[PDB]
A = this chain, B = another copy of it.
Amino acid sequence: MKTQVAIIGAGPSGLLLGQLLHKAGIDNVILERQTPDYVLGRIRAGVLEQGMVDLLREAGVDRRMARDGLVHEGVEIAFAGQRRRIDLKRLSGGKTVTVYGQTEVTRDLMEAREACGATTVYQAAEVRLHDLQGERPYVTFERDGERLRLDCDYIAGCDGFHGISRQSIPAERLKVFERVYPFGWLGLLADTPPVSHELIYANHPRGFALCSQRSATRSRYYVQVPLSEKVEDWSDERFWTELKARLPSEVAEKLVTGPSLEKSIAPLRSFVVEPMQHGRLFLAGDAAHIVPPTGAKGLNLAASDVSTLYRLLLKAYREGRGELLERYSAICLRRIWKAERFSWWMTSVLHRFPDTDAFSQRIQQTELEYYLGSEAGLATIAENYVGLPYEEIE
């Protein structure tokens, strides 16, 4: 069995890359461990940068998004009994973000891939990568008891944080940068109208809270929660009471509550690996880096890694410029670090940390007052929030 580019993982990264590649004539095969249904079960992301919206358009999978997605020109930050609105559109010079669930984006790519007839092997068990440094690498896997081999020119590891691809690179060749935060996010999806037309990030003494949405009849809420927490400990009612206690009274009053459709806890982490490639293996998305959800950069960084990889692969196949692929890591890392820096900053000013001294609490409160009250402070948040420009390569 042979292809040009083998893609490990059918999450948004692998599907986007596969679609981009297909449209340009580069055959690719996606291998996924789970079932299409399991993949569609992950709620995750809700906020997309302008640049990701454009990439979706370029992959020609933007019909439903253009119809159902909500474009946002602002976002709110509540702290110490006051809400402050940041005009993204004004402050960033016209850019906005789009709220469209990750579940939907993934569904759209999956349908688009099916219609084109491109190869996708679900339940590909025991994926193993071989000859990463040879001129002919290959992937082996098992589909219903029998071991198959897939030959390729390149492998794009788009298998998330627990994928096999990063594990296939000699550990000595990698440099890991990581920070674990002493808390997680308890998220709740409900078939209720969101409490606001724009997102509200809230710093409250009891901990962080965030009011988000998926559509006009579907809401997504989060509350900062300690690591020791178990989801079965949080009834829908306890969640609503907790969420209401962290929000400004005039917002908590108009909140329409309801039974949860999904409830989960996600720990916050920062992770970056350098470089992001080895021989003919290139890492992309969560396989290469994790950012805490606070800045909504995860899925967005994956899109840029993918945009970069695709353009380099085109150059390599169509233009015979195979040497340009060595620049992959240098290029992605620049955007990754600025995004990690932004997510880190958002996380530190919005959450309540354990055993914080009086001085640090005061400095935290002051960062908010400063950045939210200065025209220049506002602009730093906004341009970062809508997403910094992709580099064009060459």
Q: Could you tell me the distance between the alpha carbons of A374 and B363 in the complex, rounded to whole angstroms?
A: 23
- Give A319-365 interface residues, CB cut-off 8 Å to B: 337-338, 340-341, 344, 357-360, 362-363
- Give A349-394 interface residues, CB cut-off 8 Å to B: 357-360, 362-363, 366-367, 369-370, 374, 376-377, 379-380, 383
Q: Could you tell me the distance between the alpha carbons of A357 and B337 in the complex, rounded to whole angstroms?
A: 16
Least CB distance from A204 to B in Å reads: 20
A4, CB-defined interface residue at 8 Å: no
Of A31-39, A173-181, A187-195, the one contacting chain B is: A173-181
Number of copies: 2
Given A376-B376, A380-B380, also A338-B362 (CB < 8 A): no
B370 and A374 form a contact (CB under 8 A): no
Partner of A341, one of B178, B370, B379: B370
- Give A284-338 interface residues, CB cut-off 8 Å to B: 337-338
A270, CB-defined interface residue at 8 Å: yes
> How many residues of A are in contact with the other chain, CB < 8 A?
28
A16, CB-defined interface residue at 8 Å: no
A272, CB-defined interface residue at 8 Å: yes
Partner of A363, one of B176, B341, B359, B370: B341
Least CB distance from A359 to B in Å reads: 4
Q: Could you tell me the distance between the alpha carbons of A364 and B358 in the complex, rounded to whole angstroms?
A: 23
A359 and B270 form a contact (CB under 8 A): yes
Q: Could you tell me the distance between the alpha carbons of A360 and B177 in the complex, rounded to whole angstroms?
A: 9
CB contacts (< 8 Å) of A337 on chain B: these are 362, 366, 369
Chain B: which residue is nearest A342 at the CB level?
B370
A367 and B341 form a contact (CB under 8 A): yes
CB contacts (< 8 Å) of A362 on chain B: these are 177, 272, 337, 340
Q: Could you tell me the distance between the alpha carbons of A357 and B376 in the complex, rounded to whole angstroms?
A: 30
Partner of A370, one of B176, B338, B359, B367: B338
B270 and A358 form a contact (CB under 8 A): no
Least CB distance from A366 to B in Å reads: 4
CB contacts (< 8 Å) of A344 on chain B: these are 363
Chain B: which residue is nearest A380 at the CB level?
B376
Given A337-B366, A340-B366, also A177-B374 (CB < 8 A): no
Chain B: which residue is nearest A377 at the CB level?
B380
Chain B: which residue is nearest A358 at the CB level?
B177
Least CB distance from A347 to B in Å reads: 11
CB contacts (< 8 Å) of A377 on chain B: these are 380
- Give A68-114 interface residues, CB cut-off 8 Å to B: none
7 A-B pairs besides A179-B360, A340-B366 with CB distance below 8 A are A175-B358, A178-B359, A272-B362, A337-B366, A341-B363, A341-B367, A377-B380
6 cross-chain CB contacts under 8 A: A177-B362, A272-B362, A337-B369, A341-B366, A377-B380, A379-B379
